[PDB]
């Protein structure tokens, strides 16, 4: 700054921290519903697919984790047919774990 | 029927923010969100009015 | 959760073949290991942090 | 070591046989909804178990 | 009764995926019964070394 | 060489400087046609091998 200002170079960066990064599996990236259009194409596709992801990430001097959420429908349904009892059915649609 | 690859604790902290306002503290459920002073996080070095 | 070694910068991962019907997408973020307990046990003697 | 300690007596340690259970009982999770095994038709992924 | 195409009597598969938690171990196999074959599942077993 | 020749061991190698190695997915390794006989076999045209 001023009349003796030193020759200079610029650094641009950002933060956002309470966030976690999202990628909708949706034919355009909008929320048009909870059960996306591609999520329905993969039903009528009737076929198995594998997946690779490669994340490029800044080096850190300490061991760190990538945390993934495969976004999914994890759900329960609950039935109560007599005074003594409760019966629950669980489902998890991609990434299932039985019943 | 719980699973080793669910995260119920994180899921609650997100649902409470979607239902209400986390900037309001409530001693009953020990609800008082982890925060920071943003003037510490991103320093605005205006100098001083001296 | 997947390990990122000290000073590593590409973090590849793969899912074995499966079905993606009703799949919703991905969310992702970065954690420190010392700031993360393993919930896979009753106690975590390597979780030296609070 | 002492003149009294000449008079110590020893007894053999109790026998203890260790190995896997009959038919390998317990080595696989059966009847646990927390760790349920899978036999599923790829690619419908409907678990038959 | 018996075929005279070249064909294995016994197949060994290796885990397409595995998990190694504090209290249990997982393995995933793609058990592939080819065309013109049938598998009596009573003939299968998991061979563990350790 | 010559009458005072010193006891010696042989070393053998080859070079191949513009080729790239090939392995045809053909049942006898020959090129019988551009679409090979294994690429339209009963197995590989029906089932999802790894």
Automatic annotation (TrEMBL), chain D:
Domain of life the protein comes from: Viruses
Upregulating conditions: Expressed in the late phase of the viral replicative cycle.
Subcellular compartments: Host nucleus; Virion
Signal peptide annotation: none
Family: Belongs to the adenoviridae hexon protein family.
Role summary: Major capsid protein that self-associates to form 240 hexon trimers, each in the shape of a hexagon, building most of the pseudo T=25 capsid. Assembled into trimeric units with the help of the chaperone shutoff protein. Transported by pre-protein VI to the nucleus where it associates with other structural proteins to form an empty capsid. Might be involved, through its interaction with host dyneins, in the intracellular microtubule-dependent transport of incoming viral capsid to the nucleus.
Other notes: All late proteins expressed from the major late promoter are produced by alternative splicing and alternative polyadenylation of the same gene giving rise to non-overlapping ORFs. A leader sequence is present in the N-terminus of all these mRNAs and is recognized by the viral shutoff protein to provide expression although conventional translation via ribosome scanning from the cap has been shut off in the host cell.
Subunit structure of this chain's protein: Homotrimer. Interacts with the capsid vertex protein; this interaction binds the peripentonal hexons to the neighboring penton base. Interacts with the hexon-linking protein; this interaction tethers the hexons surrounding the penton to those situated in the central plate of the facet. Interacts with the hexon-interlacing protein; this interaction lashes the hexons together. Interacts with host dyneins DYNC1LI1 and DYNC1I2; this interaction might be involved in intracellular microtubule-dependent transport of incoming viral capsid.
Designated name of the protein: Hexon protein
Species this chain originates from: Human adenovirus D10
Residues included from the entire protein: 304 to 352 of 949
């Amino acid at each position: 700054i001023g009349q003796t200002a030193v020759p200079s170079v610029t650094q641009k960066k950002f933060l956002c921290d309470r966030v976690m990064w999202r990628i909708p599996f949706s034919s355009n990236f909008m929320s048009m519903g909870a059960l996306t259009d591609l999520g329905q194409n993969m039903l009528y596709a009737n076929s198995a697919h594998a997946l690779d992801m490669t994340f490029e990430v800044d080096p850190m001097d300490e061991p760190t984790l990538l945390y993934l959420l495969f976004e999914v429908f994890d759900v329960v349904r609950v039935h109560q047919p007599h005074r003594g009892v409760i019966e629950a059915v669980y489902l998890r649609t991609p990434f299932s774990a039985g019943n | 029927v719980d699973l080793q690859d669910r995260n119920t604790e994180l899921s609650y902290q997100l649902l409470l923010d979607s239902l209400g306002d986390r900037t309001r503290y409530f001693s009953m459920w020990n609800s008082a969100v982890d925060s920071y002073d943003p003037d510490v996080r991103i320093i605005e070095n205006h100098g001083v009015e001296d | 959760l997947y390990p990122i070694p000290a000073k590593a910068t590409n973090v590849p991962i793969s899912i074995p073949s499966r079905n993606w019907a009703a799949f919703r997408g991905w969310s992702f973020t970065r954690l420190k290991t010392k700031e993360t307990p393993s919930l896979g046990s009753g106690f975590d003697p390597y979780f030296v942090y609070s | 070591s002492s003149e009294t300690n000449l008079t110590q007596q020893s007894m053999p340690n109790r026998p203890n046989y260790i190995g896997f259970r009959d038919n390998f009982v317990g080595l696989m999770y059966y009847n646990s909804t927390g760790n349920m095994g899978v036999l599923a038709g790829q690619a419908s992924q409907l678990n038959a178990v | 009764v018996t075929t005279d195409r070249s064909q294995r009597l016994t197949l060994r598969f290796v885990p397409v995926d595995r998990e190694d938690t504090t209290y249990s171990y997982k393995a995933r196999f793609t058990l592939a019964v080819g065309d013109n074959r049938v598998l009596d599942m009573a003939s299968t077993y998991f061979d563990i070394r350790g």
